[PDB]
Amino acid sequence: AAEAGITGTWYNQLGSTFIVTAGADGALTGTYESAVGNAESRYVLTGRYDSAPATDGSGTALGWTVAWKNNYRNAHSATTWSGQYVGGAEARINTQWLLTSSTLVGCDTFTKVKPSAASIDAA
Amino acid sequence: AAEAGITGTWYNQLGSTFIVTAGADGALTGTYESAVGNAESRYVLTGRYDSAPATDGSGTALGWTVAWKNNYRNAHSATTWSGQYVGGAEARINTQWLLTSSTLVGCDTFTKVKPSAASIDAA
Amino acid sequence: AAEAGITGTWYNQLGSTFIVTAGADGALTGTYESAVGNAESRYVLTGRYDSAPATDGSGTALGWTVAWKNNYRNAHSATTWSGQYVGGAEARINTQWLLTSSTLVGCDTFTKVKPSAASIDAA
Amino acid sequence: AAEAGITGTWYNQLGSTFIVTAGADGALTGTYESAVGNAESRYVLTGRYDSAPATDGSGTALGWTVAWKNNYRNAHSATTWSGQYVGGAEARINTQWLLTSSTLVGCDTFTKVKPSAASIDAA
Ligand SMILES: O=C(O)CCCC[C@@H]1SC[C@@H]2NC(=O)N[C@@H]21
Ligand SMILES: O=C(O)CCCC[C@@H]1SC[C@@H]2NC(=O)N[C@@H]21
Ligand SMILES: O=C(O)CCCC[C@@H]1SC[C@@H]2NC(=O)N[C@@H]21
Ligand SMILES: O=C(O)CCCC[C@@H]1SC[C@@H]2NC(=O)N[C@@H]21
Ligand SMILES: [Cl-]
Ligand SMILES: [Cl-]
Ligand SMILES: [Cl-]
Ligand SMILES: [Cl-]
């Protein structure tokens, strides 16, 4: 049920856009558009998720990587996100990330709805 | 020159084995075998690297993900590594990692030679 | 102006309570009460902050440590928080933390007002 | 036995010097001299450790903070270290750290002996 839940479009607290297809055998493929930093437009992402998550109602483990080179620019950097997908009406991906240029750390919360402009200003 | 340098087999300070092919447009694909934790044999990895790194002699940014499910076992977890490839006679990948089951953090140093059994015992 | 701004009581997104006095020469002393984990009541904290922060309107760097032993219990663990104090009407301390038992990572946002019960349920 | 083991002088893999007294009730006080970054001479540190660690032979949890202002300079930054003290003939403090200016992450291994000049060059 993780494949159906994960596949689609996600927005983090900054308004960045995470577009992902979850493959049957645990592949993540898609694009990432960061609302911040030395980035513009979409970047290729790839990653992995647990395609047979535990039937005890907990989260699905996943992670992905973006190297910050596209046709617009090259930041000479890469970010990995590591976290858990939880489904339901308020579906979320809770992540910690590492950005290497020298490794910055932080956390991103992704949901299926764009956060309000006021919340984007706050976070 | 990053593609030629990255592609191949890497060992971390724990004796884990990282087998990777760097694709021309920035893809990382391969297998990971962890010497520790709830893991055995090889796991699929995918990731990204900067395929046009800066010509100022610094490192190449990269990252990859392993979800810890294979035909032997499923740990219901995923690790991302984020770091820099530096080439030369003592080529290295310096990484920080995030393991999500609840996110553990650490650091792995990968080289082209297996560390000595005595160093593996130490680290 | 950092001393006046920092000294007082702070609540994170989980409803944990951070009570701190900022000393003139950069000392942080006080108590921490975690709303979660293997903890109850208040624990001694100590830390440091930049007592002469830059006059360019940016944040004040700080960090503190709690070892999770008090008169109620001992979790045999310790957390450090590292982050920035920003003042004003919506004063905040943005932190990343490391909990060592084996090091967990996360992020806590502290403000001068308790988050709503509904937000505490969410975060 | 943690108090006796911790108190003293420690060197990390970079040759930085960590001088600490462990207090009876779990206080850490001392100085830190970083071999790298925007730092020179010694900086005040304070932190906490588990003063009644588990009798099952495992590590002692601890953490400390340095704000990077002294009489020589002010970097407008602060680092926290979080980790475990293990005693014996090859006594060590294994740490992860967070440096906030915007939070960098890494790991430091401290021992009672200075690493060789050749190892300092490597790490
Ligand atoms: O500045 C760079 O080097 C590239 C852009 C990085 C943007 C980071 S990645 C982590 C965080 N989450 C986001 O959606 N954007 C920032
Ligand atoms: O225990 C698990 O959940 C799966 C195995 C995780 C092994 C970790 S990943 C980070 C670190 N580096 C390694 O080579 N192995 C450990
Ligand atoms: O479980 C333990 O070992 C002690 C309690 C730890 C609580 C953590 S510390 C980081 C995070 N922020 C909080 O306010 N509480 C949790
Ligand atoms: O550059 C600064 O802002 C102050 C110096 C920071 C030095 C860091 S702290 C973590 C790491 N471990 C060390 O011994 N030094 C570096
Ligand atoms: Cl797949
Ligand atoms: Cl490619
Ligand atoms: Cl003071
Ligand atoms: Cl004490």
Q: From CA C91, how far away is CA C112, in angstroms rounded?
A: 7
Q: Is A52 helix (H, G, I), strand (E, B) or coil?
A: coil
Q: What spacing in Å lies between the alpha carbon of D22 and ligand 8's midpoint?
A: 7
Q: From CA A43, how far away is CA A47, in angstroms rounded?
A: 13
> How is residue C3 written in tokens?
């001393």
DSSP state of B90: T
Q: Which amino acid is at A107?
A: C
What is the C-alpha R_g of chain D?
14
As a whole number of Å, the end-to-end CA separation of chain D is: 31
D12 contact partners, CB below 8 Å, separation of at least 6? D18, D35, D108, D109, D110
- Is the alpha carbon torsion for C69, C74, C80, C85 positive or negative? negative
The neighbour count for residue B26, using CB atoms within 10 Å, is 24
Q: Judge whether A49 is closer than 8 Å to chain B, CB to CB.
A: yes
Q: From CA D111, how far away is CA D59, in angstroms rounded?
A: 14
CB B5 within 8 A of CB B20: no
> How is residue B113 written in tokens?
């030679």
Q: From CA B105, how far away is CA B80, in angstroms rounded?
A: 10
C90 contacts in A (CB within 8 Å)?
122
| D109, closest residue in chain B (CA to CA) | B123
User: Which residue is closest in CA terms to ligand 2's atom 15?
Assistant: B34
| Closest to B80 (Cα-Cα) out of B52, B108, B110, B58 | B108
Resolution in A: 2.0
> How is residue B47 written in tokens?
């990731």
Closest CB from C90, C107, C122 relative to A107: C107
Half-sphere exposure at residue B40, Cβ-oriented, CA atoms within 13 angstroms: 3
Q: Which amino acid is at C33?
A: E
> How is residue A95 written in tokens?
């992540």
Report CA-CA distances (Å) from B47 to A19, A67, C65, C96, D110.
Answer: 16, 9, 35, 25, 32
| C98, closest residue in chain B (CA to CA) | B105
Bridge partners of B98?
A: B80, B105
Q: From CA D84, how far away is CA B108, in angstroms rounded?
A: 18
> How is residue C7 written in tokens?
């000294």
Cα B55 from chain centre? 23
Q: Judge whether D91 is closer than 8 Å to chain C, CB to CB.
A: no
User: Which residue is closest in CA terms to ligand 4's atom 15?
Assistant: D34
Q: From CA A79, how far away is CA B80, in angstroms rounded?
A: 10
Q: From CA A55, how far away is CA C22, in angstroms rounded?
A: 48
Cα B84 from chain centre? 10
Q: Which residues of A are annotated as a binding site for biotin?
A: 32, 43, 81, 97
Q: From CA C65, how far away is CA C46, in angstroms rounded?
A: 6
Helix, strand, coil abundance in chain B, percent, nearest 5: 10, 55, 35
Q: What spacing in Å lies between the alpha carbon of D47 and ligand 8's midpoint?
A: 10
Q: Which chains touch B (3 or more CB pairs under 8 A)?
A: A, C, D
What is the C-alpha R_g of chain B?
14
Report CA-CA distances (Å) from C68 to A18, C34, C48, D9.
Answer: 37, 10, 19, 24
B36 contact partners, CB below 8 Å, separation of at least 6? B14, B16
Bridge partners of C78?
A: C67, C100
Q: From CA B106, how far away is CA A110, in angstroms rounded?
A: 24
D121 contact partners, CB below 8 Å, separation of at least 6? none
Phi, psi (deg, nearest 5) at residue B97: -130, 160
Q: Judge whether B80 is closer than 8 Å to chain A, CB to CB.
A: yes
Q: Which ligand is nearest to the CA of D2?
A: 8
Q: Judge whether B105 is closer than 8 Å to chain D, CB to CB.
A: yes
Pairing between β-strand C60-69 and β-strand C103-111 as defined by DSSP bridges: unpaired
Q: Which amino acid is at C71?
A: N
Q: From CA B74, how far away is CA D88, in angstroms rounded?
A: 36
Q: Is C103 helix (H, G, I), strand (E, B) or coil?
A: strand
Q: From CA B94, how far away is CA C58, in angstroms rounded?
A: 31
Q: From CA D44, how far away is CA D69, in angstroms rounded?
A: 9
CB A111 within 8 A of CB A92: yes
Q: Which ligand is nearest to the CA of C67?
A: 3
- Tell which one of A16, A94, A95, A109 to mutate to probe ligand 1, the residue whose CB is within 8 A of the most ligand atoms: A16
CB C62 within 8 A of CB C37: no
Residue ranges and CATH numbers for the domains of chain A are 1-123 (2.40.128.30)
Which residues line ion ligand 8, judged by CB < 5 Å?
Answer: D 23, 25, 27
CB A70 within 8 A of CB A34: no
Q: From CA C57, how far away is CA D76, in angstroms rounded?
A: 12
Q: Judge whether D107 is closer than 8 Å to chain B, CB to CB.
A: yes
Report CA-CA distances (Å) from B34 to A27, B18, B68, B69, D19.
Answer: 20, 8, 10, 12, 36
Phi, psi (deg, nearest 5) at residue D72: -85, -45
